[PDB]
Amino acid sequence: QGQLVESGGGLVQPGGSLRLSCADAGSIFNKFPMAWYRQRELVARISSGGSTNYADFVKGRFTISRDNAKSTLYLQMNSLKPEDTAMYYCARIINSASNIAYWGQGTRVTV
Amino acid sequence: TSRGIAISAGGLAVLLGALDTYVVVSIVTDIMRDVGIAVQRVTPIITGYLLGYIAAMPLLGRASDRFGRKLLIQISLAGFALGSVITALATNLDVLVAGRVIQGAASGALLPVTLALAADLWATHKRAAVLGGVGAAQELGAVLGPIYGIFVVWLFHHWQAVFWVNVPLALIAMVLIHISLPPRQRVDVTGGLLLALALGLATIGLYNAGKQVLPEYGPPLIIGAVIAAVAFLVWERFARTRLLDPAGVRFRPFLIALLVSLVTGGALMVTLVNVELFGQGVLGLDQDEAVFLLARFLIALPVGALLGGWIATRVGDRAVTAVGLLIAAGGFYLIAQWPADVLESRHDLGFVSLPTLDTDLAIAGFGLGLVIAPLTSAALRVVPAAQHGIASAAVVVARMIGMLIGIAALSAWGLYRFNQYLKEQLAALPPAPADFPGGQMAGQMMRLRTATVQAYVLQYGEIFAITAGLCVFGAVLGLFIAG
Incomplete structure (x- = not known):
């Protein structure tokens, strides 16, 4: 397989937390850069080897990570704010130089 | 004794002929303009050269067992000049291919005949270090060729200058060889x-x-x-x-040396084509940029050839070919792990870090480099004198043929498994994106592009995983080489 399947969105009281998950396949999970996007707006990016990168609005409040046992990319989101209300998408970046990407039907987060 | 000066003069001819092999890579477009060919059906300019290079080699190698090694180096240098003139005079593709054929057949003799010269003037136990120099001159010239092409067009502003410049250099080479090499029926x-x-x-x-x-x-x-x-x-x-007289030839080690040489040629060509395709297709580079990825692989080859020869005078041909091919295997196993963001990645040694792309290619090319000299040594060990020429040709022709067999076989399997991976990707990607810029057909086209890239990256892994395995198979064969 070679998937990108989001889950974990829901209603959150300000200051609360969520863990978004993005199921994938280990064939390709570790061969491309990945990212999470708002609605588009980049939230977090991770290289194939785990080098993280974040936008300004994150202020260290989230973490993007890989779990190779279930081949899932995650966003742990803590201390959520009303401004974080959005559809969140997990994207595979198919060309890193042009940052051309592909993504699925997202998961909505409302704070 | 003048053998050191003699093999230096021969090595400079080997260098000269090696530049001419891939020089066209940097002047194809300038040729296409002058010959009148549209943006390839230009391929005879490489396939014709390679025809002459490979096909004429055994017979011209054997000719050196009869007529000696000075005379044939002179003849091939004069033919290298002649072919160059014929190409420089070409208003027509049909005249270019004819001149490239003559350049190729000429240049094909220089390396085997010079390897055999080294075999004549040195005894086996120190010979491998000299074969390393001749082999280094070959691999280095092949890699500087494209740059030589660029440089002379920067000097003289017409691609024909490449093949005019060949003529004085050939005459200079004939002069060096005339004063340097030892003086002097049918094949x-x-x-x-x-x-x-x-x-x-x-x-x-x-x-x-x-x-x-x-x-x-x-x-x-x-x-x-x-x-x-x-x-x-x-x-x-x-x-x-x-052509090769079997009297006294020990064929089990001889033919294993040829088969390992064949393997090395396949691993070389597999890397030359797939890395450049991975540059364009996965990394999004220009063709000119993607070829330049090959630099640290291409530079590491002559370095390995030189040093593997010296080490083989001391540890033996069996060992250097086995270890060198395990070094090549290790390099190819690393190349099998490349992600689509490899240019951004590094190997972390804890307290120093190294670029992934550059060092995997360096390791792979250095391993293949280590194998050139001891394979030639071990083929020459098990044949009589006055079979050195045809024996040197056999080792090179096996490597050259292994290049073509390598790509054909591994591309066949890679294409087969690409399509199976493509089935898996199309089945598994999100059947559509949500709000794609340009609408749903743009999202479906990007889904199809995404599927082909993901499938190509999976193909790329298996190819270099198999290439690593075949290098280990060659390393094992390296232990049934002569000693």
């Missing part, structure tokens, strides 16, 4: 021409330039090549003269 012409015919059929039939890896004219030429090879084997049982 098996019929067997040589039969073998040349077989090699030619295989070379045309295997070379190719998207769901099919051989030209449609390929398969019958390949099957014809087998038949022409049988006719060659059959003739030389009834021939009085033989």
Whole structure:
């Protein structure tokens, strides 16, 4: 397989937390850069080897990570704010130089 | 004793002929302009050269067992000049290909004949270090060739200058060789021409330039090549003269050395084509940029050739070929792990870190480099003097043929498994994106692009995983090389 399947969105009281998950396949999970996007707006990016990168609005409040046992990319989101209300998408970046990407039907987060 | 000066003069001819091999890579477009060819059907400028290079090699190698090694180096340098003039005079593709054929056949003799010169002037136990220098001159020239092409067009502003500059350099090489090398009946012409015919059929039939890896004219030429090879084997049982006379030749180690040489050539060509395709297709580079990825692989080859020869004077040919091929295998196992963001990645040694792309190619090319000199040494160890020429040609022709067999076989398997991976990707990607810029057909096209890239990256892994395994198989064969 070679998937990108989001889950974990829901209603959150300000200051609360969520863990978004993005199921994938280990064939390709570790061969491309990945990212999470708002609605588009980049939230977090991770290289194939785990080098993280974040936008300004994150202020260290989230973490993007890989779990190779279930081949899932995650966003742990803590201390959520009303401004974080959005559809969140997990994207595979198919060309890193042009940052051309592909993504699925997202998961909505409302704070 | 003047053997050091002699092999230096020969090595400079080997260098000169090696520049001419891939020089065209940097001037194809300038040729296309002047010859009148549209943006390739230009391929005879490489396939014709390679035909002459491979097919004429055994017979010109054997000729050096009779007529000596100075005379044939002079003849091939004069033919290298002649072919260059014919190409420089070309208003027409048909005249370019003819001149490139003559350049190729000429340049093909220089390396085997010079390896055999080293075999004449040195005893086996120190010889491997000298074979390393000659082999280094070959691999280095092949890699500087494209740059030499750029440079002379920067000097003289016409690609024809490449092949005019060849003429003085050839005359200079003939002068060095005239003063430097030791002064001074038939060869098996019929067997040589039969073998040349077989090699030619295989070379045309295997070379190719998207769901099919051989030209449609390929398969019958390949099957014809087998038949022409049988006719060659059959003739030389009834021939009085033989191209390689089997008296005293120990064929088990000789043929294993040829088969390992064949393996090394496949690993070389597999890397030359797939890395450049991975540059364009996955990394999004220009063709000119993607070829330049090959630099640390291409530079590491002559470095390995030189040092592997010196080490083999001390530890033996079996060991350096085995370890060198395990170094090549390790490099290819690392290349199998490349992600689509490899240019951004590094190997972390804790307290220093190294670029992934550059060092995996360095390791792979250094391993293949280490193997050139001791393979040639071990082939020459098990043949008499005055078979050195035809024996040196056999090792090179095996490597050259292994390049073409390598891409054909591994591209066939890679294409087969690409399509199976493509089935898996199309089945598994999100069937559509949510709000794609440009609408749903743009999202479906991007889904299809995403599927092909993901499938290509999975193909790329298996190819270099198999290439690593075959290098280990070659490393094991390295232990049944001579000693």
